[PDB]
Ligand binder design. Sequence first.
Ligand SMILES: CCCCCCCCCCCCCCCCCC(=O)OC[C@H](COP(=O)([O-])OCC(O)COP(=O)([O-])OC[C@@H](COC(=O)CCCCCCCCCCCCCCCCC)OC(=O)CCCCCCCCCCCCCCCCC)OC(=O)CCCCCCCCCCCCCCCCC
Ligand SMILES: CCCCCCCCCCCCCCCCCC(=O)OC[C@H](COP(=O)([O-])OCC(O)COP(=O)([O-])OC[C@@H](COC(=O)CCCCCCCCCCCCCCCCC)OC(=O)CCCCCCCCCCCCCCCCC)OC(=O)CCCCCCCCCCCCCCCCC
Ligand SMILES: CCCCCCCCCCCCCCCCCC(=O)OC[C@H](COP(=O)([O-])OCC(O)COP(=O)([O-])OC[C@@H](COC(=O)CCCCCCCCCCCCCCCCC)OC(=O)CCCCCCCCCCCCCCCCC)OC(=O)CCCCCCCCCCCCCCCCC
Ligand SMILES: CCCCCCCCCCCCCCCCCC(=O)OC[C@H](COP(=O)([O-])OCC(O)COP(=O)([O-])OC[C@@H](COC(=O)CCCCCCCCCCCCCCCCC)OC(=O)CCCCCCCCCCCCCCCCC)OC(=O)CCCCCCCCCCCCCCCCC
Ligand SMILES: CCCCCCCCCCCCCCCCCC(=O)OC[C@H](COP(=O)([O-])OCC(O)COP(=O)([O-])OC[C@@H](COC(=O)CCCCCCCCCCCCCCCCC)OC(=O)CCCCCCCCCCCCCCCCC)OC(=O)CCCCCCCCCCCCCCCCC
Ligand SMILES: CCCCCCCCCCCCCCCCCC(=O)OC[C@H](COP(=O)(O)OCCN)OC(=O)CCCCCCCCCCCCCCCCC
Ligand code: HEC
Ligand code: SF4
Ligand code: F3S
Ligand code: FES
Ligand SMILES: [Ca+2]
Lengths: 74, 285, 59, 103, 321, 196, 44, 43
Amino acid sequence: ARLWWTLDPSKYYLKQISSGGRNEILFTVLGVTAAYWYFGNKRCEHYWRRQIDNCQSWSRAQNINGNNLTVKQY
Amino acid sequence: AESNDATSICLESISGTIKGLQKANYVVEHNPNLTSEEKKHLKQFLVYRYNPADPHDQPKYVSYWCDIKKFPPMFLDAILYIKNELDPTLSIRRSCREGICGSCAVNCDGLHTLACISGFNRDLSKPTIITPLGHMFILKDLVVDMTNFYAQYKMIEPYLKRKTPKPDANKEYPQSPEQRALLDGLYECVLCAACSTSCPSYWWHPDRYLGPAILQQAYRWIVDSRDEYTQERIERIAEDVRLDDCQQIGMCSFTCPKGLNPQLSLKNLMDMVKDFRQKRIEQEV
Amino acid sequence: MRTKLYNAAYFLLNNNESFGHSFGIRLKIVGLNTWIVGYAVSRYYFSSLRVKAAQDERF
Amino acid sequence: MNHSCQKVFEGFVSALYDTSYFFRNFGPFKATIHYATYANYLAQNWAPRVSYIETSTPAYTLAKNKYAVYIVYGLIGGALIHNYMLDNKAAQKSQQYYLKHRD
Amino acid sequence: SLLVVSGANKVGQGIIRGLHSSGKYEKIVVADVFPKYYYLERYLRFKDTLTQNKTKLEEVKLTDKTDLESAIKKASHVVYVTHDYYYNVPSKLNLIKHTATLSRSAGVKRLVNVTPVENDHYGESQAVLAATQSENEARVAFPGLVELKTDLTFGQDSTVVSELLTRLAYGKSIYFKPSAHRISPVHTLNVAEATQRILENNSLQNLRYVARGTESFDWNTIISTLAAAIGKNANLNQNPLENIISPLSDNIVSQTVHHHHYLNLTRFINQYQEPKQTEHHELTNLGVNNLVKFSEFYKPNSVSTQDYQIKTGLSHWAHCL
Amino acid sequence: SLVSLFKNTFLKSRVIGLSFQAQRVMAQMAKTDFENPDEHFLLNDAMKYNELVFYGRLAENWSINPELFGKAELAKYNEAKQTLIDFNQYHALVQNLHEFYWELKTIYLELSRGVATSNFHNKREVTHSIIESDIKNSIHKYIQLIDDLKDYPEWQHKVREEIGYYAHMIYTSVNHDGNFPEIFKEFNKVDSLYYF
Amino acid sequence: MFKELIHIFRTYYITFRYLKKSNINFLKNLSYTLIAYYLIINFQ
Amino acid sequence: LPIRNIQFARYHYLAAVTVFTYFATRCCLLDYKKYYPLASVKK
Ligand SMILES: CCCCCCCCCCCCCCCCCC(=O)OC[C@H](COP(=O)([O-])OCC(O)COP(=O)([O-])OC[C@@H](COC(=O)CCCCCCCCCCCCCCCCC)OC(=O)CCCCCCCCCCCCCCCCC)OC(=O)CCCCCCCCCCCCCCCCC
Ligand SMILES: CCCCCCCCCCCCCCCCCC(=O)OC[C@H](COP(=O)([O-])OCC(O)COP(=O)([O-])OC[C@@H](COC(=O)CCCCCCCCCCCCCCCCC)OC(=O)CCCCCCCCCCCCCCCCC)OC(=O)CCCCCCCCCCCCCCCCC
Ligand SMILES: CCCCCCCCCCCCCCCCCC(=O)OC[C@H](COP(=O)([O-])OCC(O)COP(=O)([O-])OC[C@@H](COC(=O)CCCCCCCCCCCCCCCCC)OC(=O)CCCCCCCCCCCCCCCCC)OC(=O)CCCCCCCCCCCCCCCCC
Ligand SMILES: CCCCCCCCCCCCCCCCCC(=O)OC[C@H](COP(=O)([O-])OCC(O)COP(=O)([O-])OC[C@@H](COC(=O)CCCCCCCCCCCCCCCCC)OC(=O)CCCCCCCCCCCCCCCCC)OC(=O)CCCCCCCCCCCCCCCCC
Ligand SMILES: CCCCCCCCCCCCCCCCCC(=O)OC[C@H](COP(=O)([O-])OCC(O)COP(=O)([O-])OC[C@@H](COC(=O)CCCCCCCCCCCCCCCCC)OC(=O)CCCCCCCCCCCCCCCCC)OC(=O)CCCCCCCCCCCCCCCCC
Ligand SMILES: CCCCCCCCCCCCCCCCCC(=O)OC[C@H](COP(=O)(O)OCCN)OC(=O)CCCCCCCCCCCCCCCCC
Ligand code: HEC
Ligand code: SF4
Ligand code: F3S
Ligand code: FES
Ligand SMILES: [Ca+2]
């Protein structure tokens, strides 16, 4: 059998762009900005929460037809 | 007038496979009128027989009991004794009789080899089985269709190509004894295909993958110092899986009756192809 | 046209050390990869199973 | 196969081939496929990367191409650590706010 | 036939014009890397400024050594002209060695290496010695090679002089750290004439020449002369950004702020030293005795700004495209 | 017209830059076989292949603004545009030949699956009529193609060596009885002798 | 790795021979995209 | 020939393979519901 395992990068994808190295910083800036936005939203939603349980938290239920939900004691 | 036959063909295929597994190695006695006492003095050859030209014939082993004290001790001698004395309808290729032409390559009792320079088990108890090369289409008896082998051989351009004119035309392309011994043990191939019919990569991909023998010939024409199309040949053999399919099993060097080492040649070819791929990038810059 | 046939080589070749040595490595790698993929599939399958229901329950 | 089923099968495969050919070679569809193929090629074979073949003498290689990896690592690590610190600060702020509001 | 290696350069353009306007050379082929389309467009739009003759003109892109070798194989005379690009280009040193080697491999009647100082890459350690060693190695690879090291070129076929004229005309500041060594400008026309003589004469037991235009000048004197000729005033070291970043440095910010060609220009101004060596023979030995005097060429008000206009607004970014 | 300036600059840059590469890409495509003519570009190195394929359409279709072009520049752009159109036609031709090759290889693959050792479920002794007709018509088209390439010896030789290989393998897959003489009548003239 | 899996399937399965190098490349691109999506999503 | 940041590429590929395998197989996050019958109890 032939040995083929290796961690080295393939030369097919190792080319540079004409003006220099590949667009690494430009894409990393976008990635960092997107991560900042996403994690900021997640943190804001997560931390500023409380559960308030009282009569005003309950409303009258209804069917998908909009009528009030009541089930008989059949 | 004809109709769909998927179901009938499927049922017949399954049933035939099962029955053949039950009745594998079907054998027919050439001469049933033999007293078991006589068979003590005679050795048994099971010879594969099949005549696709005849629509009523099917493959089968035929059992021949022969006195091994009537002909020399080689597979070809026994085959020809059977043909001439017992049944002259047997078919086999034979030209040289001294292991040079390479036409008589067959599966001599479990190993691909030339039948003319291969002995057989002298013991009278164990039977000897002679069958054609394994993965080659069978034309008749021990004759296979080696046409594809030759067609592949043609694709390597096995002729000296030179890009530089000879300086004087009254001399011979100079080549020192070292550049000649570089070919020793590499130009003796007789194109018997015994090795290539034993290469599993050649079993699986007969067409896309050239055999060990053809690749060894390409290596012979590459390492030759007189030719100047080294890189061109390397690139040509580097396409798809013409060479990459080799898995270095090494059976090719084990079966070669001539003692050659196609495995080493293929290994060197792989190294040269890798270097060619790398330095197509490294050099041109 | 009667299609031609052949005798598969591996059915009629005496077992050799080269076949064993090479196919051993190939089977080692095949077993490794198959084991990994099958473990992944097994975890997926078992996690896909439903929860136990009561006795003689409809819906 | 039966020649009637042969007619049906030939017609069906001809219809499939014609449908595929029309859909691929129609003007707008052809343009869409042609542009999307190149977009996919750009994405797959020219994605952002940190390792690349250096074919230029040290005098002819920019500094950006010698410290791009370090800049990327700095950006990513700083983003992660700053997000962690922001999470801790938000935890403290929320705790203090809801504590001072009641209990 | 002629192959002009790295001819897109302004000095290369001048030499190409000189060779094209002198008949002969049934086919002239210009080979260059052409990094960005701006340079190719510049060369092509120069190609309009040529009186049409029998000579045919063609362009070749030196993407890899295969192209260079193929072009050389189809040539009888070769004229190498350093380069004009810094960063993301093969080299100014390996290129000449490869040219010499390939030329020797496929027999070439004549190989002339023009090496203007203004084009050498002065952003590397021991730039002048690096260039000298590159020339020596190239000569070793091709003993019959002819050498012609020019010393600052003016006229509309120059790199540094044209750059300075554009800067002064637009009022751009100039980071100026002059070196003490004197300068001797040479009109590119005289360089083209010398190249013609080298290509035609043959024999030529003397294989080292230098293009040196009599009158000597200090760097400050040259800038003063150019400013007088263009009709503006020099703005030396007038940009605080330059003072802070010091384009003489090669840090990340310096490279990513200023134009690379401007960096090399100021580094050349700072690291300039006379090219003439005891082994060179002046162009007077090639018969070119009527050299164009630099001072008389750039008389006051003898240069018009409109010959150096550039795109200013976002249209300028079309160059980066 | 700033947008016009940018459009024309983009077109000029891309088209002229690729025109200097079309020779190399076309030569590489010729070098490989017809099974996957773009094999080298997919596996080893994409030497501006996808770029040529994409920008050929733009060269053909997108308009030009000569007032934004010089004289020599406009001549060069027209030359490059013609080169890209030539590449378009060349790619179309190679694609057609490659698809015909794959037709023949499909026929051969059906035969091989028929004679495969693992095929314990679909083993057929006698070739059926449909595949015979397919073989006959495919060989007829192949012979017509070989005839049509009489003015291009290199192309004719490549078409033979590549496509006719599977025709030869199909020839070897079956016995010489039944309708075999009629099916391979055209193949037996010259091609059969070549593949021996 | 992916290359090796495709090579094994091509060399052992006769039916898989039907696929071109182009189709194999399309599968390669889709698999890479799915792997990137998997890596990204698991952390979300 | 030289490859910029080759070691970084090797380690990035190794990390990608490790993370993908970890999430696909969940090798580290086993299930212990099968061991509960074979475990002692407290309280
Ligand atoms: C971000 C949010 C918005 C995203 C919007 C995306 C929209 C995409 C629409 C695509 C439409 C079809 C396009 C057809 C092609 C037309 C353009 C063209 O031909 O190229 C021109 C131009 C030059 O091409 P070329 O001359 O042929 O050069 C290549 C040659 O080989 C010659 O090479 P060379 O050596 O000469 O060098 C030339 C160099 C020249 O290149 C450049 O100059 C470009 C450099 C980068 C941009 C620089 C400018 C930055 C500032 C832009 C500011 C814009 C402001 C906009 C304001 C708008 C206000 C309204 O070329 C390159 O290097 C090409 C770069 C390719 C980058 C590909 C990126 C792939 C990955 C993307 C996703 C990454 C996710 C990571 C997540 C990881 C998390 C861990 O290239 C481009 O325009 C590049 C575009 C690349 C991206 C397109 C595809 C994006 C797809 C994203 C994934 C979305 C999936 C969603 C699910 C799917 C269903 C929806
Ligand atoms: C020919 C006919 C053959 C018929 C066979 C029929 C077999 C029927 C099987 C029925 C199902 C058995 C399931 C066992 C589950 C075991 C785990 C367990 O208890 O989990 C609890 C399970 C929850 O699972 P989980 O915890 O979420 O995750 C389980 C995972 O396995 C993860 O748990 P873990 O993290 O603890 O995992 C332990 C770790 C352990 O891994 C290791 O460390 C490996 C250690 C290996 C050591 C081996 C030593 C052997 C020694 C060799 C020596 C050779 C010497 C030679 C010398 C030569 C001379 C020198 O990983 C593994 O166990 C590896 C598993 C992956 C397998 C990869 C290969 C897959 C493809 C190949 C399959 C076999 C093909 C054979 C073909 C044969 C052809 C002829 O929940 C239960 O309580 C279920 C209990 C099991 C019953 C399930 C019933 C389902 C019924 C479905 C309806 C259809 C049924 C159809 C039946 C048909 C019958 C004919
Ligand atoms: C849900 C999420 C969605 C978003 C994410 C998506 C992610 C997945 C990827 C999707 C990929 C597939 C996309 C769908 C396929 C679209 C096919 C298509 O366009 O069909 C046209 C195509 C017809 O065009 P054709 O046959 O190719 O051309 C001949 C015609 O006679 C026409 O001849 P003509 O000369 O009269 O007109 C030519 C031109 C109109 O000509 C013009 O007016 C000029 C257009 C711009 C030219 C390029 C100037 C670049 C200047 C530099 C910019 C630098 C920016 C900053 C960065 C600097 C540093 C790098 O019209 C086109 O062909 C437009 C095609 C699309 C844009 C091509 C330009 C690419 C480069 C510029 C954009 C990318 C940025 C690159 C930056 C870097 C560059 C180095 O076929 C159709 O008509 C099909 C119609 C039905 C299908 C849907 C149509 C959708 C139309 C969308 C228009 C979008 C316009 C751009 C918006 C940009 C917003 C920021
Ligand atoms: C529970 C969750 C859900 C599970 C099911 C999920 C299914 C997902 C979708 C699967 C889609 C599969 C089809 C598309 C792939 C490509 C197929 C293809 O090439 O098409 C043409 C090709 C037919 O080509 P052809 O020209 O007709 O054949 C002649 C060529 O020379 C032939 O040349 P060749 O080399 O191309 O042909 C080789 C061919 C294989 O085809 C063959 O040539 C023969 C197939 C039958 C072999 C049967 C065994 C023969 C005897 C071996 C020894 C067994 C000993 C057992 C007892 C041991 C006792 C100790 O290989 C394949 O089929 C490739 C893919 C195989 C794996 C994927 C399919 C797995 C199906 C598993 C369930 C099957 C149904 C239940 C069975 C059990 C019921 C109790 O395949 C088909 O059309 C048939 C497809 C397969 C049908 C099922 C046959 C049984 C397979 C069992 C495999 C078990 C593996 C172990 C793990 C199983 C875990 C579930
Ligand atoms: C219609 C269009 C056509 C559709 C077709 C169908 C398929 C879809 C196609 C769509 C097109 C895009 C497809 C995805 C890209 C595929 C790329 C590919 O296949 O490349 C193979 C190719 C394989 O090559 P290879 O030879 O095998 O080598 C690979 C090795 O991994 C070698 O890798 P490497 O070594 O070069 O590394 C790569 C590099 C790549 O990374 C980057 O540079 C990129 C960075 C992230 C940028 C993210 C930008 C995202 C922007 C998004 C903006 C919003 C978009 C919204 C769009 C909406 C719609 C318009 O990695 C890094 O930079 C490593 C960073 C590690 C950071 C470590 C942190 C350390 C912290 C500690 C610091 C030190 C502390 C010390 C403390 C000491 C205490 C004592 O990959 C590459 O070579 C490129 C690198 C890999 C890039 C992967 C990018 C994946 C992006 C997925 C995006 C999915 C978006 C879905 C959106 C859905 C919306 C609905
Ligand atoms: C090596 C190459 C091949 C590799 C292949 C890899 C495949 C990867 C597949 C990935 C996707 C995995 C999806 C898993 C779905 C499993 C569904 C299933 O059957 O689960 C078991 C289920 C009962 O489970 P559950 O209701 O949860 O009850 C136990 C709870 N403690 O059971 C039931 O409810 C039983 C009813 C549903 C199942 C019906 C199955 C019908 C099969 C018909 C076969 C027809 C062909 C026959 C061929 C032979 C003919 C002679
Ligand atoms: C892409 C790189 C850019 C961008 C973003 C800017 N310019 Fe420059 N510029 C560029 C090139 C290729 C050239 C040609 C230089 C040469 O003659 O070889 C120039 C040139 C100039 C000039 C004239 C020459 C000089 O002054 O050095 C000026 C003036 C100039 N550029 C200015 C300028 C300004 C103000 C920019 C805004 C940031 C700018 N450029 C951007 C390429 C590019
Ligand atoms: S390679 Fe070996 S077995 Fe094959 S023909 Fe040559 S000598 Fe004979
Ligand atoms: S037996 Fe077979 S696959 Fe390779 S090295 Fe030897 S050939
Ligand atoms: S019989 Fe002569 S070599 Fe076989
Ligand atoms: Ca040789």
